[PDB]
Design a protein around this ligand. Structure first.
Ligand SMILES: Nc1ncnc2c1ncn2[C@@H]1O[C@H](COP(=O)(O)OP(=O)(O)NP(=O)(O)O)[C@@H](O)[C@H]1O
Ligand SMILES: Nc1ncnc2c1ncn2[C@@H]1O[C@H](COP(=O)(O)OP(=O)(O)NP(=O)(O)O)[C@@H](O)[C@H]1O
Ligand SMILES: Nc1ncnc2c1ncn2[C@@H]1O[C@H](COP(=O)(O)OP(=O)(O)NP(=O)(O)O)[C@@H](O)[C@H]1O
Ligand SMILES: [Mg+2]
Lengths: 498, 255, 503
């Protein structure tokens, strides 16, 4: 959208500078869509809070209706709104059509685009990858957002009745729905691939029409990342890399906000480049730099057929995939998962609990109701934690539990604890042997020492990526995919900064 | 009744349950809002602020049972609730009303507190064991015959003290017992509930005990003066509620 | 409504002076809505009781007949009797229309009889008719009309239960019920004679039609809805909840502990929830779902969702809202299916709060676990606090009191019993709340912060002091209270100083 534009423009010194009266300090400033929009994070000494200010090329009140006029005509051009047309061409017409200062030109095309190809009033928010949530509550209420770093902050964008009503139609339409007083609520998904709740009128929202947008922008923490944060030691990560390659199933358990999903997504970047993976989640959260992958998302059924995790797994496990990822088990679908395990599908997921005992309880009891005897097919179960002191915010893998199996005439769940985390020294201690490594020698058909050797090898590879500052997930997945293809060549490039 | 202690009248069929209830329901404070739910009208009250609700058979319309009627009555958050007789599900709602402070009263077909407990706990009534604690008093009515000697007597005045943790559960203190050999009512324990009143009222027991003896005199006088009718009786009782002092004097001065 | 009227009034002094014979003595008088209505508590000393007198502008057998005459014509107009229309403009469609009929029939009324007739037309058209005065008087909390020819009884905030002078006969009462009922979107009739609805303003209605299931005639009962939200200060001042418990709750909702306030119908459950819901941190995202708009908050970043009875239910809205990232979710009252969903929101990290109809905590568990709600036992663990409201009644006084505060620790490993802790219990005796123990939830907070339990506790006392300081300074209204609380959030010490320093 902006590359096609930003060239058709003439000037480059568009948009002036911000002017905030006293008590309105400027915390930070950064670009969004240079050189059009820029965002400024202002403070406000009185109310210890920061505020998000959305900057766009300032215009004249004469240029107002002027630009709103050039638009009143370009609107009656069906060949513009048509999405069937590639944006590259569509733009051209708008330009040519506009032919019928060398600075006012550019600082104008911006809008003409922001309203035909952009998202309008909220484009600055849709484009900024720091804003992961947009909340337009009601008529004449300043929009709020969730900043990647600032969190909840008020915004300089407000929409009066009509301005918002049309906004809600714009979003609703681009998402492919027809919100009306007859169907005032829409829970669809925008083209950019984002979750949009929307309400028209005031029948359900006395505070007027409204909308919310949860942007899938994430930037998933990486295995290397976990090593840096001291969350999981490099050696444990290698053990998992192997485990994951061999299809040992794992569940990440932990108190709410302790790290479960992050860790999962992190270690899910260890999946073999060619393996077919299918994921089922209630809402997108998992980012993977993997191709042969199908992502399935649950359906609310607000106004259609409700398709839950159970429905989605049952028909996915049917495509007989290699790896199966279930966002988090919160019910019935849990049975199907363990069934998938008993069958050899490398299955992974999350579970809200504090220790293996709670894990077992939740899994066995309704709603999950996973049969006691099925637990044997789970291989590893990690336990994540949050640890705090000063502003000391720590997320750690409290423990790496190896589920050995079931016992006949028992207590049942046989667990061998490999790694334990001591908080007193913030250290991970080996408190038993990694038995699973033995099951690998059996799979692979080699000796333990041999496997142990590869672990130490894979371990080195990770510590190197760390030293070389290879943090991003896209780049990390590339170097791991690398190692899978040819560990020899992979290792050498790593040691030779390439 | 004034203090809202809930009571159930139990007794064999035709022993007096409903009569006794209606009788003692004429002790309700003149201004209190009372709602009654019955399968068929039987309760007569010389009370104004009262709503009488009657069950619907549904012969050719929508059937509305005691459950439906109570559930939406207890909703009007009334002072006193009267359920003709509990014969099922609606019994749960009643005791719920009790646990909540609604002076609730009703009837139950049974011969002794043991049968009462059984019927109430078991289906169709199925009132949860632990809920019984909210019932305060449970009277037991009887029929007694010899020659043409037809007698209806309150066999016993049972005070339900409460539940016991690790138990047998229903703690009952029997205040009055009826000896048929001499046709006399014998006190076989203290009226504990009078103590709970001192606590409510914020006075001493002796003090309450005093008012009892007072209210007792008032009744024996109405008796001596032949004030039998319910319309006239409810008037003199309403009287006492408004001003016991003035009420007592008119009574002693045949007016 | 009346400010509009007070405009066109065209005069004042429309009320005379009542004639209560002896055996009757005025106890108190006061405008309900001057210069039209006025309440006069009269003491029929013979019967040693009071008797609320709704006083309205006097009219003669001849006058009222004339009034009723205009009503018949004006009745033709639909606009003025249409709810979707702005009261203000249809209030003129009325005066501008009375102008017509007047000048046309060539007649000019008295400046007074106008500022009298006008009152009645607005009343029977826009207001609540015969009971409007009761529906207006801020002191009446309940209105109870038992049947044909039976005097309406009300509950006066100062005299409690009292007999009223307003009496509706069959013809009048049946209309009254149909009107109230219709006015609530629901329908009533001999076919279906019982209705449980809520009036446009929030007041809860319980009506009955004919003598079908209710001999003595049709009847209704209204439980008015207070327009101004009680605040945690109001609650400390009313002896309904201790400032300590309140401070405890402040921290708890700040730290996103999910809680449900339990109680009997009309026990003040919603009122408490709205009060403590003022402790929500300022920038957080609040989403509220209700069947009846009731909760009033001074919180900008909040979307108020409302049920559609036709069709959109709480369940739909709840699961919808849950696909976003709201910080706080308020339900108002879980009555069915959604109760499951609401307990999951808890499970997945959403600060969730709601009202529930039950008397004990035992009853809470039972009502939760069984149909229609059907919440699995393993899920209750996710509820943090459970308060219990009770409306204690003793004499001509009613006391809404937080009867008990419970903490749900967890689920016992044996018999999977709910681990609960009752740290505060109310005492009807001395009307004193008692701390049977110290909050165990304080440790969960300490960890979530990395501070010692001792440190959290002192923070509590601080907020507690802040609350009592606000009270002592007479800061009661919700907008201003919310304002001062949001402050303590932004900066505590600066907030404390300014409090004890008069600013
Ligand atoms: N190891 C870590 N180091 C630093 N921040 C982390 C770490 N793990 C998670 N976080 C952050 O902590 C927050 C917690 O979310 P996350 O831990 O992903 O979900 P969760 O609590 O496990 N729940 P779920 O997503 O339902 O499984 C996110 O904002 C993460 O970015
Ligand atoms: N104390 C009493 N003295 C004389 N006659 C009585 C007395 N109590 C009841 N009766 C009469 O005995 C008959 C029994 O009816 P009643 O005792 O009212 O109902 P019940 O058997 O308790 N059943 P229910 O009405 O369903 O609770 C009636 O005709 C009454 O008038
Ligand atoms: N603490 C209080 N002090 C005085 N009046 C109160 C108090 N709390 C509530 N009320 C009033 O009591 C009535 C009860 O209202 P509310 O709390 O909304 O209902 P509830 O108990 O939730 N019952 P329901 O509406 O049946 O679910 C209202 O008129 C309130 O204004
Ligand atoms: Mg409520």
């Amino acid at each position: 959208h902006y590359d096609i534009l930003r060239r058709h423009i003439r000037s480059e010194d568009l948009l002036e500078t911000p002017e905030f009266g006293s008590g309105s300090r400027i915390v930070e400033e950064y670009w969004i869509q240079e050189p059009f929009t820029k965002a400024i994070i202002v403070e406000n000494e009185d109310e210890f809070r920061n505020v998000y200010y959305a900057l766009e090329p300032t215009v004249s009140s004469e240029e107002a209706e002027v630009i709103s006029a050039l638009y009143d005509d370009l609107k009656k051009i069906l060949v513009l709104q048509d999405v069937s047309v590639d944006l590259e061409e569509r733009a051209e017409v708008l330009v040519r059509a506009i032919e019928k200062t060398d600075n006012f030109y550019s600082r104008m095309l911006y809008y003409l685009f922001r309203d035909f190809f952009g998202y309008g009033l909220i484009d600055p928010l849709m484009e900024d990858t720091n804003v992961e949530d947009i909340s337009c509550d009601g008529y004449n209420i300043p929009i709020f957002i969730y900043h990647q770093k600032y969190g909840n902050v008020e915004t300089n964008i407000v929409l009066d009745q009509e301005k918002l009503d049309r906004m809600v139609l714009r979003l609703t339409q681009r998402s492919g729905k027809h919100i009306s007083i007859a169907n005032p609520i829409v829970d669809a998904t925008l083209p950019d691939g984002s979750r949009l709740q929307a309400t028209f009128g005031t029948e359900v929202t006395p505070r007027g029409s409204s909308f919310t947008i949860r942007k899938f922008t994430i930037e998933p923490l990486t295995p290397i990342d976990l090593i840096e944060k001291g969350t999981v030691p490099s050696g444990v990560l290698a053990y998992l890399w192997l485990a994951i390659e061999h299809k040992f199933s794992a569940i990440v358990v932990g108190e709410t906000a302790s790290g479960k999903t992050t860790t999962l997504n992190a270690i899910m970047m260890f999946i073999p480049p060619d393996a077919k993976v299918v994921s089922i989640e209630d809402t997108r959260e998992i980012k993977l730099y993997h191709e042969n992958w199908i992502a399935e998302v649950t359906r609310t059924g607000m106004g259609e057929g409700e398709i839950d995790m159970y429905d989605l797994l049952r028909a996915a496990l049917r495509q007989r995939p290699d790896y199966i990822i279930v966002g988090e088990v919160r019910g019935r679908e849990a049975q199907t998962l363990f069934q998938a395990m008993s069958t050899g599908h490398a299955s992974y997921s999350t579970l809200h609990a504090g220790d293996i005992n709670q894990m077992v309880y939740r899994l066995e009891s309704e709603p999950l109701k996973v049969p006691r005897s099925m637990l044997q097919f789970l291989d590893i179960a990690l336990v994540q934690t949050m640890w705090v002191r000063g502003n000391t915010r720590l997320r750690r893998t409290k423990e790496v539990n190896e589920i050995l199996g079931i016992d006949p005439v028992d207590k049942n769940l046989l667990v061998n604890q490999f790694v334990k985390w001591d908080p007193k020294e913030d250290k991970h201690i080996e408190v038993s042997m990694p038995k699973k490594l033995e099951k690998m020698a059996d799979f692979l058909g080699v000796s333990v020492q041999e496997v142990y050797d590869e672990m130490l090898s894979r371990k080195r590879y990770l510590e190197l990526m760390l030293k070389r500052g290879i943090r991003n997930y896209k780049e990390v997945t590339r170097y791991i995919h690398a190692y899978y293809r040819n560990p020899e060549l992979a290792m050498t490039k790593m040691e030779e900064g390439l | 009744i004034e203090h809202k202690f809930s009571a159930i009248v139990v007794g064999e069929t035709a022993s007096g349950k409903t009569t006794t209830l209606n009788a003692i329901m004429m002790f309700i404070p003149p201004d209190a809002k009372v709602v009654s739910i019955e399968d068929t009208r039987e309760i007569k009250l010389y009370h104004e602020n009262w709503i009488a609700e009657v069950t619907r058979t549904g012969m050719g319309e929508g059937e509305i049972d005691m459950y439906d009627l109570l559930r939406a009555a207890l909703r009007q958050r009334p002072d006193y609730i009267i359920v003709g007789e509990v014969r099922g599900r609606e019994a749960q709602t009643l005791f719920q009303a009790m646990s909540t402070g609604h002076a609730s009263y009703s009837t139950l077909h049974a011969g002794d507190i043991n049968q009462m407990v059984y019927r109430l706990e078991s289906e169709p009534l199925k009132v949860p064991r632990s809920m019984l604690q909210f019932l305060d008093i449970a009277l037991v009515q009887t029929m007694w015959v010899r020659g043409n000697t037809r007698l209806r007597r309150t066999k016993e005045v049972n005070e339900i003290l409460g539940i016991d943790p690790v138990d047998k559960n229903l703690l009952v203190n029997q205040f009055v017992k009826w000896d048929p050999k001499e046709d006399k009512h014998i006190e076989v324990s203290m009226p504990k509930k009078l103590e709970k009143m001192a606590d409510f009222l914020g006075v001493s027991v002796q003090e309450v005990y005093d008012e009892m003896l007072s209210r007792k005199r008032y009744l024996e006088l109405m008796l001596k003066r032949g004030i039998r009718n319910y319309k006239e009786v409810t008037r003199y009782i309403h009287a006492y509620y408004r001003n016991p002092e003035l009420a007592m004097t008119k009574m002693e001065e045949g007016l």
